[PDB]
């Protein structure tokens, strides 16, 4: 449902879908797969349906936590909610 | 983007939409200047919204050019710098 | 057509379980004999149609002894006699003899 | 108001051709427009705008009448919904005139842009206009032009409007698709309207098309699994609108379909059927053959296959008949499959000399049908050529043999427990 | 009966309320207390175990700490922030002159709710958010009140500076309290009246202690973005200058339709003079075409000022009916004051 990003989506599958299938490809070749992923660009262009398309094609565990929801009305609850994720 | 990365988005969204066989999407692609993905989504939606008040069902070619001038202007009336010094 | 079921026979009295033996009020017995009436005169199509409601009612509402089975197996005694199946005909006459 | 004086407005133009009628319609167009616009739903009289149709009908060709509807379509037309009531007026003089206007009627439909281009869909009219053009093409002998017109009409489905009538419009293309020579086009249409109407009750005229189109598509497919499925659904459920005299023989073809199909789960359902045993003897004759699937010796089957063919080579209410070879082409292939299933479940091993006598075939024809069932995952049999025998016993591991032995040990404990409680139960008769 | 019920009421004690967290055993669950600690609690045999699953708000006990009663989901009910207290005042007859721009609201409100099947067959997605901009006094606020007196569905009044309450992470949790009713009642519309705040920008100068506000800005970037069900709840947003708001929030994907509310022209104002003077008593001879040319860059509200000043001019002369001469004096009185600017808004598109 989203075209034109095949150049960008190809690098996403290598850093997301690829290490979740075969983990020995990075050990034999000797390349450290990126653990974190940041997505830049002006707000309202990418992201959005891209993460949903990758999560649907992977068919595995997926956790989506909003960046503004970590803070809780209680004080010490903030660091505990981050650990539970 | 360019006329390459953009035309993949128009043809993909038009699959779920209903247009006329005489409508040409390549006419607006040449005139695209400094656009994004969210702007393209609003063009296909507004083209179908105005068809209700115009007593139409499928999106014609005339409605694509009328609804394009709304989201192309990037600031207020000035586009970006408009043209002057 | 004068009696039928639960018209003239049902006023102040509850169900005695039809015309099984001696005392009773005709409900399922007349409907069973109409099928027997058309059994020895007309074809067996109209006879089996009345036997469908008799088999479902007997398996639903019954009692400890055997009463309705006498009038139920009486019609089936001559029903399977004209047919070509002698295996189900023996099972019908066996319970009717009891 | 001014709408009741329209009869007395123009005296002379009624008795003459009135070439100025085109100018009188434009004068009333701008006056009645400002008094309605998009505010009032119904304000101006629709007969005033549609009066131009009744002025020139049989006294003028329909080419000039289509030009008036073109100007009203491009302009406002005194109302936004006025077009809805104008086409309703168009449907009157069409069936009441005919004569030499049937040839020019084709050009009238193609000239109107409302029936061609897509609109807000207030019409519930053009759906019948499109059907009238297709009925003309079918009378001219064009199978391709008739199916292509209704194909694009079914793409746009109206929201509610007609309910039972819309079903006939969806099923209309399925009837013309097979006449085109392709039965795969109507398969897509059967996956949409059938699901929506599955839970909705169908009337008498509704189920008449499903009695044919559902089994007609699979007729050319020669797949009997889908023929005995959709047919029994309409047959068993309801189907009380038809006559019971012709309703009973319909089942005679249903049982005949189970033999040509690779068995099924509907065979045991028709054995306990009340109407299947009694009434028509052909119903019981084919039902008696169902119980012969396990007992099939193949001995008496070709005797009846060459003599009695009540439902075999003669079809009336289902296939209507095709040929004696077509009905017997897959018949002989199934009868062989009925015997091989019995031997596989009975004979552990049998010689090729005796197996050929039981199948009434040669050595090449015997191994042809046996080897085909092995690849389908049905019958597994080891053919021993040196010994000229076929071993039907499938190999079992050591765990499978010990597992079945464990079920017997648990079964013996059930008989020991059952008899143990029967001593107290039968003590009443013994202790009496 | 009032006295006997008092003694029977004092026998009952307090009962805690908490939401079911997770499930350990069949009869053993975990419910988070309203104070923020989490205690493992039990259940009884008088309640259904199907409604005891996660997310369901139940009733605990202040002593035994066990699940007792099952209650429907209510997250901080506020009568001022939820119930509209509807009293019919202004209708579509008072917002007249905007008719060209009135069909824009009914297109994104009346059309998708009455016949949602139209957008499904065409393929277009129903507009989610709606932007209302332009200078004040054009009747933008009256557009939200005219809908509440017509349809009657569940509506929400959301002031900008009422949700900025700050204790610990409070401003971020208030937004999630609003969308809780969106999934319960499907025909709901969230009104926004004169909100330049929650759509701000403010990335980092040092943040000036915006910590809860920056998350509140992101709350609109979640509910209208992520996988939560949408399309049944319309967002009506009103603002003065969109340039102050975050440009990312104005882009499509959150606010789909931008409704232009310009200053009513000579044809638009012509029907507005009769609206404000409808209930005002005057003489038999009246002409509203004179005040049309007298109006220079006015709006729909400023005519109400012209009708208000015309009443006080007749008090000194002891006149219950306002003469046409007193009208032209009050119409120019707004044109004499001025100093309101109003021509500096370039965002018309």
């Amino acid at each position: 449902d989203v075209g034109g990003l095949d150049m960008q989506k190809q690098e996403i599958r290598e850093a997301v879908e690829l290490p979740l299938v075969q983990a020995d490809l990075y050990e034999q070749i000797g390349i450290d797969p990126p653990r974190g992923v940041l997505l830049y660009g002006p707000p309202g262009t990418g992201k959005t349906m891209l993460v949903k398309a990758v999560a649907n094609s992977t068919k595995a565990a997926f956790i989506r936590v909003n960046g503004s929801e970590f803070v809780h009305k209680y004080l010490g609850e903030g660091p505990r909610m981050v650990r539970d994720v | 983007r360019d006329r390459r990365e953009r035309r993949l988005i128009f043809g993909t969204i038009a699959s779920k939409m209903s247009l006329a066989p005489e409508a040409d999407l390549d006419s607006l692609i040449i005139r695209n200047d400094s656009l994004s993905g969210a702007v393209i989504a609003a063009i296909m939606q507004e083209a179908g919204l105005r068809a209700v008040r115009k007593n139409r069902y499928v999106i014609l070619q005339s409605d694509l050019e009328e609804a394009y001038a709304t989201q192309v202007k990037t600031d207020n009336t000035v586009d970006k710098f408009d043209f002057y010094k | 057509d004068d009696l039928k079921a639960q018209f003239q026979e049902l006023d102040s009295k509850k169900q005695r379980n039809n015309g099984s033996k001696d005392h009773g009020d005709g409900i399922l017995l007349i409907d069973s004999e109409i099928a027997r009436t058309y059994l020895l005169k007309n074809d067996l199509v109209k006879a089996r149609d009345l036997l469908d409601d008799l088999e479902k009612t007997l398996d639903k509402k019954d009692s400890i002894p055997l009463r309705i089975t006498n009038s139920f197996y009486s019609t089936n005694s001559q029903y399977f006699k004209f047919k070509n199946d002698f295996n189900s005909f023996y099972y019908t006459s066996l319970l009717y003899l009891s | 108001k001014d709408y009741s004086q329209i009869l007395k407005e123009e005296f002379p133009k009624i008795d003459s051709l009135a070439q100025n009628d085109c100018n009188s319609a434009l004068d009333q167009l701008l006056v009645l427009e400002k008094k309605t616009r998009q505010a009032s739903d119904l304000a101006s009289s629709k007969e005033v705008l549609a009066k131009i149709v009744d002025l020139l009908a049989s006294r003028n060709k329909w080419d000039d009448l289509n030009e008036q509807l073109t100007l009203l379509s491009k302009k406002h037309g005194q109302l936004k919904l006025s077009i809805q009531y104008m086409i309703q007026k168009v449907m009157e003089y069409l069936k009441s005139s005919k004569s030499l206007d049937l040839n020019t009627r084709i050009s009238v439909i193609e000239t109107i842009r409302v029936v061609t281009e897509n609109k807000i869909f207030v019409e519930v009219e053009r759906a019948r206009v499109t059907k009238d053009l297709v009925e003309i093409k079918k009378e001219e002998g064009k199978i391709d032009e008739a199916a292509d017109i209704l194909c694009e009409l079914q793409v746009e489905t109206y929201g509610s409007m007609e309910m039972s009538e819309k079903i006939q419009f969806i099923l209309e293309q399925m009837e013309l698709s097979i006449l085109k020579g392709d039965y795969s086009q109507a398969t897509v249409l059967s996956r949409k309207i059938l699901k929506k109407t599955f839970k909705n009750p169908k009337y008498e005229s509704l189920k008449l098309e499903y009695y044919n189109l559902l089994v007609k598509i699979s007729l050319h497919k020669r797949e009997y699994l889908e023929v005995a499925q959709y047919l029994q659904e309409i047959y068993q459920t309801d189907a009380i609108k038809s006559d019971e005299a012709k309703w009973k023989p319909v089942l005679s073809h249903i049982v005949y379909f189970l033999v040509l199909s690779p068995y099924g789960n509907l065979q045991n359902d028709l054995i306990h059927k009340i109407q299947n045993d009694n009434n028509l003897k052909k119903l019981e004759s084919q039902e008696s053959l169902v119980k012969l699937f396990t007992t099939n010796e193949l001995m008496r089957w070709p005797i009846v296959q060459k003599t009695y063919e009540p439902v075999l080579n003669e079809d009336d209410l289902a296939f209507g008949g095709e040929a004696n070879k077509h009905h017997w082409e897959d018949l002989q292939k199934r009868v062989i499959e009925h015997n091989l299933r019995v031997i596989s479940e009975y004979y552990s091993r049998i010689t090729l000399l005796r197996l050929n006598e039981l199948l009434d075939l040669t050595e090449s024809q015997t191994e042809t049908y046996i080897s085909d069932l092995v690849n389908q995952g049905i019958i597994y049999a080891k053919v021993n050529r040196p010994a000229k025998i076929v071993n039907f016993e499938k190999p079992k591991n050591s765990s499978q043999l010990l597992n079945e032995w464990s079920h017997n040990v648990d079964e013996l404990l059930e008989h020991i427990e059952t008899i143990g409680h029967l001593i107290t139960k039968e003590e009443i008769m013994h202790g009496l | 009966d009032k006295t006997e019920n008092d003694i029977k009421a004092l026998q009952s004690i307090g009962q805690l309320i908490g939401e079911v967290m997770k499930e350990l055993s069949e009869e053993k669950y975990i419910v988070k207390a309203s104070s923020g600690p989490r205690y493992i609690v039990g259940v009884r045999n008088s309640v259904d175990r199907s409604k005891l699953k996660k997310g369901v708000r139940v009733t605990l006990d202040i002593t035994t700490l066990t699940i007792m009663r099952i209650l429907p989901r209510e997250t901080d009910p506020l009568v001022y922030n939820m119930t509209s207290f509807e009293q019919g005042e202004i209708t579509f007859d008072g917002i007249g002159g905007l008719t060209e721009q009135i069909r824009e609201l009914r297109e994104v409100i009346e059309l998708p709710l009455k016949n949602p099947e139209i957008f499904q067959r065409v393929g277009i997605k129903p507009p989610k958010g709606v932007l209302l901009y332009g200078p004040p006094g054009t009747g933008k606020t009256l557009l939200a009140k005219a809908v509440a007196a017509t349809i009657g569905a569940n509506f929400i009044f959301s002031p900008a500076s009422g949700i900025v309450d700050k204790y610990i992470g409070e401003s971020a949790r208030i937004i999630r309290e609003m969308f809780a009713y969106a999934k319960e009642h499907e025909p709901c519309i969230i009104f926004m009246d004169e909100v330049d705040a929650i759509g701000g920008r403010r990335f980092s100068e040092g943040t000036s202690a915006d910590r809860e506000i920056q998350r509140t800005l992101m709350e609109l970037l979640t509910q209208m973005d992520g996988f939560d069900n949408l399309g049944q709840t319309k967002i009506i947003m009103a603002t003065n200058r969109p340039d102050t708001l975050d440009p990312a929030l104005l882009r499509p994907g959150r606010l789909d339709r931008k409704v232009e509310i310009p200053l009513p022209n000579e044809a638009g104002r012509l029907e507005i003079f009769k609206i404000h003077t409808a209930k005002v008593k005057k003489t038999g001879e009246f002409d509203f075409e004179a005040a049309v040319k007298m109006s220079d860059g006015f709006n729909g509200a400023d005519i109400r000022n012209c009708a208000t000043e015309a009443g006080f001019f007749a008090i000194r002369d002891d006149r219950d009916h306002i003469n046409p001469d007193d009208l032209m004096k009050a119409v120019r009185k707004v044109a004499e004051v001025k100093k309101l600017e109003g021509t500096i808004e370039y965002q018309k598109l």
Side-chain angles (χ1 to χ4, degrees):
Chain A
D1 290 344
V2 176
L5 292 174
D6 290 344
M7 294 300 294
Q8 184 175 355
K9 291 189 295 184
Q10 185 63 59
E11 296 301 321
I12 295 170
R13 294 182 182 175
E14 294 178 350
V16 175
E17 294 178 351
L18 178 62
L20 295 175
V21 176
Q22 295 300 321
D24 290 344
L25 296 175
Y26 295 93
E27 294 178 351
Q28 295 300 321
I29 297 171
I31 294 172
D32 186 5
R35 295 181 182 175
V37 175
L38 293 176
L39 297 174
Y40 295 93
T45 59
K47 293 180 295 297
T48 310
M49 297 300 293
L50 293 175
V51 177
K52 185 178 180 180
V54 176
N56 291 337
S57 63
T58 300
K59 294 177 179 177
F62 177 79
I63 294 170
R64 180 179 181 274
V65 177
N66 291 337
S68 64
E69 190 176 2
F70 294 98
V71 176
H72 189 276
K73 294 176 179 177
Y74 180 76
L75 178 63
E77 185 67 14
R80 292 193 298 273
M81 292 178 70
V82 176
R83 294 182 182 175
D84 290 344
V85 175
Chain B
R1 296 182 181 276
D2 58 353
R3 292 192 297 273
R4 179 60 179 165
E5 294 178 350
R6 290 194 297 271
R7 64 180 296 176
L8 296 175
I9 296 171
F10 295 97
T12 300
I13 296 171
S15 296
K16 294 177 179 178
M17 298 296 180
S18 296
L19 276 67
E22 294 178 350
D24 186 4
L25 295 175
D26 291 344
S27 63
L28 296 175
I29 295 171
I30 296 170
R31 294 182 182 175
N32 289 338
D33 186 4
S34 296
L35 296 176
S36 63
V39 176
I40 295 171
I43 295 169
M44 296 300 294
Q45 293 177 336
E46 183 67 14
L49 293 173
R50 294 182 182 175
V52 176
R53 293 173 296 180
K54 293 177 179 177
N55 291 337
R56 300 289 182 268
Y57 177 78
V58 296
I59 295 171
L60 296 175
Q61 186 174 355
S62 63
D63 290 344
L64 295 174
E65 294 178 351
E66 294 177 351
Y68 175 77
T70 299
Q71 295 300 321
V72 64
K73 189 182 293 178
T74 59
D75 187 5
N76 288 334
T77 58
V78 297
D79 186 67
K80 293 177 179 178
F81 297 97
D82 192 4
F83 178 80
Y84 62 91
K85 182 178 179 180
Chain C
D1 291 344
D2 291 344
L3 276 66
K4 293 177 179 177
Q6 294 178 336
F7 294 99
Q8 295 300 321
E9 296 300 321
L10 175 64
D11 187 5
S12 63
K13 183 180 66 64
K14 293 178 178 178
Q15 185 173 355
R16 299 292 293 173
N17 290 337
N18 65 40
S20 296
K21 294 176 179 177
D22 290 344
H23 59 283
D25 54 351
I27 295 170
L28 296 175
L29 177 63
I30 295 171
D31 291 344
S32 64
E33 294 178 351
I34 294 171
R36 182 177 181 171
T37 299
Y38 297 141
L39 177 63
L40 296 175
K41 183 178 179 180
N42 290 337
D43 58 353
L44 276 66
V45 176
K46 294 177 179 177
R48 183 178 181 172
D49 291 344
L50 296 175
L51 296 174
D52 291 344
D53 291 344
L54 296 174
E55 183 178 2
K56 294 177 179 177
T57 300
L58 177 63
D59 290 344
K60 183 178 179 180
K61 294 177 179 178
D62 59 353
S63 179
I64 296 171
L66 296 175
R67 57 176 65 88
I68 297 170
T69 59
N70 190 340
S71 64
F72 178 80
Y73 296 140
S74 178
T75 300
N76 290 336
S77 178
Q78 295 300 321
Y79 176 78
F80 296 96
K81 183 178 179 180
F82 296 96
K83 301 302 287 185
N84 290 336
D85 186 4
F86 296 94
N87 290 283
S88 296
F89 178 80
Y90 176 78
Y91 177 78
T92 299
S93 296
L94 177 63
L95 296 175
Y96 177 78
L97 178 62
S98 63
Chain D
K1 294 177 179 177
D2 291 344
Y3 296 92
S4 63
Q5 294 177 336
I6 186 169
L7 296 175
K8 294 176 179 177
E9 291 178 350
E10 295 173 349
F11 296 96
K13 293 185 175 74
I14 295 171
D15 291 344
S16 178
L17 190 147
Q19 294 177 336
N20 291 283
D21 289 344
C22 296
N23 291 336
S24 64
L26 296 175
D27 291 344
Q28 295 300 321
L29 177 63
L30 296 175
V31 175
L32 275 65
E33 184 278 336
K34 294 176 179 177
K35 294 176 179 177
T36 300
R37 293 182 182 175
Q38 294 178 336
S40 178
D41 291 344
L42 177 63
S44 63
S45 178
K46 62 189 183 70
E47 183 67 14
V48 176
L49 178 62
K51 183 178 179 180
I52 190 65
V53 176
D54 290 344
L55 294 174
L56 296 175
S58 296
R59 293 173 296 180
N60 189 340
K61 294 177 179 177
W62 294 356
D63 291 344
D64 291 344
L65 178 62
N66 291 336
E67 294 177 350
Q68 294 300 321
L69 296 175
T70 300
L71 296 175
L72 296 175
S73 296
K74 294 177 179 177
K75 293 181 181 297
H76 183 197
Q78 296 176 337
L79 179 63
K80 62 182 178 181
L81 296 175
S82 63
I83 297 171
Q84 184 175 355
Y85 295 93
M86 292 300 294
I87 295 172
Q88 294 177 336
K89 180 62 174 172
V90 176
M91 294 300 294
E92 294 179 351
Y93 63 90
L94 294 175
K95 294 177 179 177
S96 64
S97 178
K98 294 177 179 177
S99 178
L100 296 175
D101 290 344
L102 296 175
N103 291 336
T104 59
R105 182 177 181 171
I106 295 170
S107 63
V108 176
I109 295 170
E110 294 178 351
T111 301
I112 295 171
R113 296 176 63 185
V114 177
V115 63
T116 299
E117 294 178 350
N118 290 283
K119 302 299 183 181
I120 190 169
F121 296 159
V122 296
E123 296 302 322
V124 70
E125 294 301 321
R126 61 179 295 274
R128 293 178 179 84
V129 176
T130 300
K131 183 178 179 180
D132 290 344
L133 178 63
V134 176
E135 293 177 351
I136 296 170
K137 302 299 183 181
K138 291 189 295 184
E139 294 177 351
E140 294 178 351
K142 302 299 183 181
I143 59 172
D144 58 353
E145 294 178 350
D148 290 344
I149 295 171
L150 295 175
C151 183
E152 294 178 351
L153 177 63
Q154 295 177 336
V155 176
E156 296 84 357
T157 299
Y158 298 93
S160 296
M161 292 178 180
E162 295 301 321
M163 294 183 286
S164 63
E165 183 67 14
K166 181 179 76 179
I167 296 170
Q168 185 64 59
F169 295 159
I170 303 301
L171 296 174
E172 183 67 14
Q173 183 63 59
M174 293 177 70
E175 183 178 2
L176 276 67
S177 296
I178 296 170
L179 296 175
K180 184 178 179 180
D182 186 5
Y183 62 90
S184 63
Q185 185 63 59
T187 300
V188 176
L189 296 174
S190 63
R191 294 182 182 175
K192 294 177 179 177
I193 190 65
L194 178 63
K195 294 177 179 177
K196 294 177 179 177
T197 59
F198 177 80
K199 294 177 179 177
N200 290 336
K202 294 183 175 74
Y203 295 93
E204 182 178 2
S205 63
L206 276 66
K207 293 177 179 177
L208 295 175
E209 296 301 321
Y210 294 93
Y211 176 78
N212 290 283
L213 296 175
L214 294 176
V215 297
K216 184 178 179 180
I217 295 170
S218 296
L219 187 146
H220 300 290
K221 184 178 179 180
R222 292 178 64 85
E223 184 67 14
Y224 295 93
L225 294 175
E226 294 177 350
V227 175
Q229 185 174 355
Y230 295 93
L231 177 63
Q232 186 174 355
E233 182 179 2
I234 304 301
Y235 176 79
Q236 185 174 355
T237 59
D238 290 344
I240 61 172
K241 302 299 183 181
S242 178
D243 186 5
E244 294 178 350
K246 294 177 179 177
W247 182 88
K248 295 175 180 177
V250 176
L251 179 63
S252 63
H253 294 82
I254 295 171
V255 177
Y256 176 77
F257 297 159
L258 296 175
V259 176
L260 296 175
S261 64
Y263 295 93
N265 291 336
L266 296 174
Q267 294 178 335
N268 291 336
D269 291 344
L270 296 175
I271 295 170
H272 300 290
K273 179 62 174 172
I274 295 170
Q275 295 300 321
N276 191 29
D277 181 67
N278 62 346
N279 290 283
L280 178 62
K281 294 177 179 177
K282 295 176 180 177
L283 296 174
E284 183 178 2
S285 296
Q286 295 300 321
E287 182 179 2
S288 63
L289 297 174
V290 176
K291 294 177 179 177
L292 295 175
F293 294 161
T294 301
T295 61
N296 187 339
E297 295 177 351
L298 192 144
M299 293 177 70
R300 294 182 182 175
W301 291 91
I303 295 170
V304 176
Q305 186 174 355
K306 293 176 180 177
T307 300
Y308 295 94
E309 302 88 358
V311 296
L312 277 65
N313 63 346
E314 183 178 2
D315 290 344
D316 290 343
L317 296 175
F319 292 161
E322 294 177 351
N324 291 337
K325 183 178 179 180
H326 297 166
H327 297 166
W328 294 356
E329 183 178 2
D330 290 344
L331 177 63
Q332 186 174 355
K333 294 177 179 177
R334 299 290 182 268
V335 176
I336 296 170
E337 294 177 350
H338 298 293
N339 192 341
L340 296 175
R341 182 177 181 171
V342 176
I343 295 172
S344 64
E345 294 177 350
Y346 178 79
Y347 296 96
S348 296
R349 61 180 65 86
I350 185 169
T351 59
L352 294 175
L353 296 175
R354 180 59 179 165
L355 178 62
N356 290 337
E357 293 177 350
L358 295 175
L359 296 175
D360 289 344
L361 295 175
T362 59
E363 294 178 351
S364 296
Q365 295 300 321
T366 299
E367 294 178 351
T368 299
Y369 295 92
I370 295 171
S371 63
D372 290 344
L373 296 175
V374 176
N375 191 30
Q376 294 300 321
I378 295 170
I379 294 170
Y380 295 93
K382 294 177 179 177
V383 176
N384 190 340
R385 186 175 178 84
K388 294 177 179 177
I389 62 172
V390 176
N391 191 30
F392 296 93
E393 182 178 2
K394 291 189 295 184
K396 294 177 179 177
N397 291 336
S398 64
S399 64
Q400 294 178 336
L401 296 175
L402 295 175
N403 190 30
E404 294 178 350
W405 182 87
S406 296
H407 299 291
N408 290 337
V409 175
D410 291 344
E411 183 178 2
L412 295 175
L413 296 175
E414 294 177 351
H415 299 291
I416 294 171
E417 183 179 2
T418 299
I419 295 171
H421 300 293
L422 294 175
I423 295 171
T424 300
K425 292 166 62 181
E426 294 179 351
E427 184 67 14
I428 296 170
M429 295 300 294
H430 297 165
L432 178 63
Chain E
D1 290 344
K2 294 177 179 177
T3 300
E4 294 177 350
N5 290 336
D6 291 344
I7 303 301
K8 294 177 179 177
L10 295 175
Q11 294 177 336
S12 63
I13 61 172
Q15 296 177 338
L16 296 175
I17 294 172
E19 294 178 350
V20 176
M21 293 295 102
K22 62 180 293 180
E23 295 178 350
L24 296 175
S25 178
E26 294 178 351
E27 295 177 351
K28 183 178 179 180
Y29 296 140
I30 295 171
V31 173
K32 182 173 178 290
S34 64
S35 296
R38 293 178 179 84
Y39 299 142
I40 294 172
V41 297
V43 296
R44 293 176 298 178
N45 291 283
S46 64
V47 296
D48 186 5
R49 292 174 296 180
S50 296
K51 294 177 179 177
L52 294 175
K53 294 177 179 177
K54 61 180 180 296
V56 176
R57 184 182 296 275
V58 297
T59 299
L60 296 175
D61 181 67
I62 61 172
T63 59
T64 59
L65 295 173
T66 57
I67 295 170
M68 294 179 70
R69 294 182 181 175
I70 295 170
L71 296 175
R73 184 184 296 274
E74 295 301 321
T75 301
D76 188 5
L78 296 175
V79 294
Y80 295 92
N81 290 282
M82 298 297 179
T83 60
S84 64
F85 297 97
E86 183 65 15
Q87 185 174 355
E89 183 178 2
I90 303 301
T91 59
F92 294 99
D93 290 344
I95 62 173
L98 296 175
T99 300
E100 294 178 351
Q101 295 300 321
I102 292 172
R103 59 176 182 183
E104 296 301 321
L105 296 175
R106 293 182 181 175
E107 183 178 2
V108 297
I109 294 171
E110 183 178 2
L111 178 62
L113 294 175
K114 183 178 179 180
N115 290 283
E117 62 184 343
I118 295 171
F119 295 160
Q120 294 178 336
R121 292 192 297 273
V122 176
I124 60 173
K125 294 177 179 177
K128 294 176 179 178
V130 175
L131 177 63
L132 295 175
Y133 62 89
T138 59
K140 179 179 74 180
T141 300
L142 296 175
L143 295 175
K145 294 177 179 177
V147 177
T150 300
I151 303 301
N154 190 30
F155 294 157
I156 294 170
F157 294 160
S158 178
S161 62
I163 61 172
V164 298
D165 186 4
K166 179 172 179 290
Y167 295 94
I168 295 170
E170 183 67 14
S171 178
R173 297 295 181 190
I174 295 170
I175 303 301
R176 295 183 180 276
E177 296 176 350
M178 294 176 68
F179 295 96
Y181 295 92
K183 294 177 179 177
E184 294 177 351
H185 300 290
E186 296 301 321
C188 57
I189 295 170
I190 294 171
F191 294 159
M192 301 301 293
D193 186 4
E194 296 300 322
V195 177
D196 60 354
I198 61 173
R201 182 181 64 197
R202 290 175 61 86
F203 292 163
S204 179
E205 290 300 321
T207 63
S208 296
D210 63 11
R211 184 62 62 185
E212 295 183 355
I213 293 170
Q214 184 63 58
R215 291 193 297 274
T216 300
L217 174 63
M218 297 297 103
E219 294 302 321
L220 296 175
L221 275 66
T222 58
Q223 295 299 321
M224 293 184 286
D225 187 5
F227 299 158
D228 290 343
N229 190 340
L230 295 174
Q232 295 300 321
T233 299
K234 303 300 182 181
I235 303 301
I236 303 300
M237 183 177 284
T239 188
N240 290 283
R241 181 177 181 171
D243 290 344
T244 300
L245 296 176
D246 186 5
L249 188 146
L250 297 175
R251 296 178 64 185
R254 294 177 179 83
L255 296 175
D256 290 344
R257 298 296 300 278
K258 294 177 179 177
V259 176
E260 183 179 2
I261 305 300
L263 296 175
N265 61 345
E266 294 178 351
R269 291 193 298 273
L270 177 62
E271 294 178 351
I272 297 171
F273 294 100
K274 294 177 179 177
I275 293 170
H276 302 290
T277 59
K279 294 177 179 177
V280 176
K281 293 177 179 177
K282 61 180 180 296
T283 59
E285 183 178 2
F286 57 89
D287 186 5
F288 295 100
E289 294 178 351
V292 175
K293 294 176 179 177
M294 294 299 294
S295 64
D296 186 4
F298 293 162
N299 59 35
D302 290 344
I303 296 171
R304 180 66 65 184
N305 191 341
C306 297
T308 299
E309 296 301 321
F312 296 96
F313 295 160
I315 295 171
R316 294 182 182 175
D317 291 344
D318 187 5
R319 299 290 182 268
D320 290 344
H321 300 290
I322 295 171
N323 290 336
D325 291 344
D326 291 344
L327 294 174
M328 294 178 71
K329 294 177 179 177
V331 174
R332 183 178 181 171
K333 183 178 179 180
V334 176
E336 293 175 350
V337 175
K338 300 302 287 185
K339 294 181 181 297
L340 189 144
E341 294 177 350
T343 60
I344 62 172
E345 292 82 357
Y346 296 92
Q347 69 283 359
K348 302 293 179 63
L349 59 82

